[PDB]
Symmetry: D3
Subunit: 144 residues, 6 copies
Amino acid sequence: VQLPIEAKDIQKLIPHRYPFLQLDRITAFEPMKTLTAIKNVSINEPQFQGHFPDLPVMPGVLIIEAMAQACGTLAILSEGGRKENEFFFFAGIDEARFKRQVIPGDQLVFEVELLTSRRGIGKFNAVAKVDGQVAVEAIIMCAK
Amino acid sequence: VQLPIEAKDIQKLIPHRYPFLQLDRITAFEPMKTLTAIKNVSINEPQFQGHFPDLPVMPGVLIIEAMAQACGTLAILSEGGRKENEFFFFAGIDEARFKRQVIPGDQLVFEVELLTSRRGIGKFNAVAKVDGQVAVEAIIMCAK
Amino acid sequence: VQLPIEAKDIQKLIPHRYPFLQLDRITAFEPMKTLTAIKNVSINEPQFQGHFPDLPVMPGVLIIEAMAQACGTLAILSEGGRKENEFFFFAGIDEARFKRQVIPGDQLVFEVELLTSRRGIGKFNAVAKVDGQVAVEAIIMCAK
Amino acid sequence: VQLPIEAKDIQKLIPHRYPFLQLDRITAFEPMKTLTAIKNVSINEPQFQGHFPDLPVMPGVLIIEAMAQACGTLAILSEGGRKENEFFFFAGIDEARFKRQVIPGDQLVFEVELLTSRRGIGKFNAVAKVDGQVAVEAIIMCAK
Amino acid sequence: VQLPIEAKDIQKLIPHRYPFLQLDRITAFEPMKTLTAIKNVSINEPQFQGHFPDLPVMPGVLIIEAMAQACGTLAILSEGGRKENEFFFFAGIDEARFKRQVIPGDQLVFEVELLTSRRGIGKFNAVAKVDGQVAVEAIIMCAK
Amino acid sequence: VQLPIEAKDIQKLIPHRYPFLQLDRITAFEPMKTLTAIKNVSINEPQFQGHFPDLPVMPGVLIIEAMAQACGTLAILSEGGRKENEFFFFAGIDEARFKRQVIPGDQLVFEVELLTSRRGIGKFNAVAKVDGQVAVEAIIMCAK
């Protein structure tokens, strides 16, 4: 697979579309092992009308959603799949901590790792950094 | 406090606004203990443009966000507070399981419970039901 | 036909899409006679940015539009039709009364009835209830 | 009062905001009698994402809503009122006929007339024209 | 070609969609020479949430974008092309002056003219009028 | 002034709001001379629903708008002004070339310079880079 995977091509892999596509670009990929993706945070995003009116703060849950989407794409790429034939459900979130406020101008770097794969259910470790510092970390479960 | 607390009044309690206000109404409240809230799921919501284009599925993370908002309002109401004083951060998610697809037409009923309050950090149990069945359950941490 | 008809399948019947699809689910249907549909009202809907800024109130005209859509789907289902082969125009509204404020958290229940079918023009009676109380009633004309 | 009343000033008269402000400009006004207003129809309006995906057609109910807003502003201007003191409810619609498809590029001209004012309830005749042809006509009731 | 070209058909010619389709209707056309198009400005457009919060002012750059789209369609129509085969890039803007505030209620009339076509790069003169007065004028370059 | 200036504070300087605030952060500033600002490009931005449906491409005109906003803020900061105080109009664009496609994932770096200030009219040179490469360059005029 050709890196980086641009947003236009992430869309060929997963069905998510605006305003629920929370990855901009896949930058690293080791089959069945790891993936790096980014999401640029901009004040021109729909969530910032309401979160919060004069104080833009990237919602943690959207960072979580990006983490899950990264995990899902890692899985999909690993079996050479596409959006038309395969779906991985978001099954659970495990040890999610929100450590840093993320704001417009920040580039989120997501690093995810496949830990265990018992019976179509994948357990992943996922972290989201801004400028090297951890902003959110969590364990993410996906189910085929 | 006068029940039900309508959306217009939820907004006097928390700063969240469209499209990140994910409670429609508070229906039950026991100070320092429990709260029930609802969120109506409709096809006329912004997330359903992209999640997913022909197949509307309420994103789990938005159900999580609602659960967190319910926990936070339970806390706020318990110290008779408002949106303009100080704030409860979303600190973590613990044991979140996504058990049922939620779809337009479903009314989400959120029941949350304050478990422990060890030094500014509140640990809550939260469940989200549709028609009596559990759709999502999770432990939610908020920090003052 | 299999009830309830979910939003995803309402979209196979009528061309309306976000933000102008104002039915969430079809719950009852008697061919050439009656139909029940619901629409969940949530603060997370686009109209509530502007109607009104701090006071969410479901616009009557959108309740009217839902009524018309329910009438139209009753008609379509009655001739086993689809969205791709022909269209029922909204021809007129006759004795529309707005009796109750509808607000986030309310579930609108729409009950519509085919009265007469003189000359490709269908005259319907339509009512919209919240919790058993009438909120809006009207006569709706559709033309094939 | 100074004519034309621009959108910026229509907003000082009525509480409606995006996406539910359906008048662009007030062009004529006779106290307690008549008003003319316009609404420009553009493909760059939020309703045209869904109404309909490849076939932009101005929803009749929004034309109705504009008619009602024109009536309401006629009333407000007639008692020299503002958005912060007075509210006129939309009470009913009477003899509404949808005669012409309205499309992007059309400028809607609204001409409304106060017929009767029995006990705080105002009955108005309203027509909406494009290029001189009637597109929608209706009787509009507002209540103080 | 059949005039006027309505928005529904402009979309068969160029790929631009909501909220970046800034032409409502093509009204005049001389192959390889000139084109007239209109864009209705309405308070019900997404840019007016932010530009500016209580003071709606049509952004100059969107007028520029419309001018470019008009130039592009003039080119496309001139080689009988469509959106699925041929595309013209926006290459530059030359002598753009913003002379008049444009506001809701204004109808923008765009008149564009092909000046030179040296080697796939088309240089156009473009003006945008409201009620005959120039609001914006510019030279627009497109590249095949 | 304290650098970086975050989006929340850019808003105290200029009246632009969603979806027409096209700067995320001010990173450099020399009074009456230069300014650097960034804008993160994400697939989660409103323009990418329509520009273009399956092929996200940052519109050149929005890059232009950002360049102008950067120029304007340079000016505002230089006379210690604010948004409630006064306003710099966008007066013209001079020698604008679009050299590179900008896509989700790209961070735009804007570097602007005050050239001349002949009587309330400021002439600026402006460039927008992604990863060191020029994407757009232009001369920007603002008028007080």
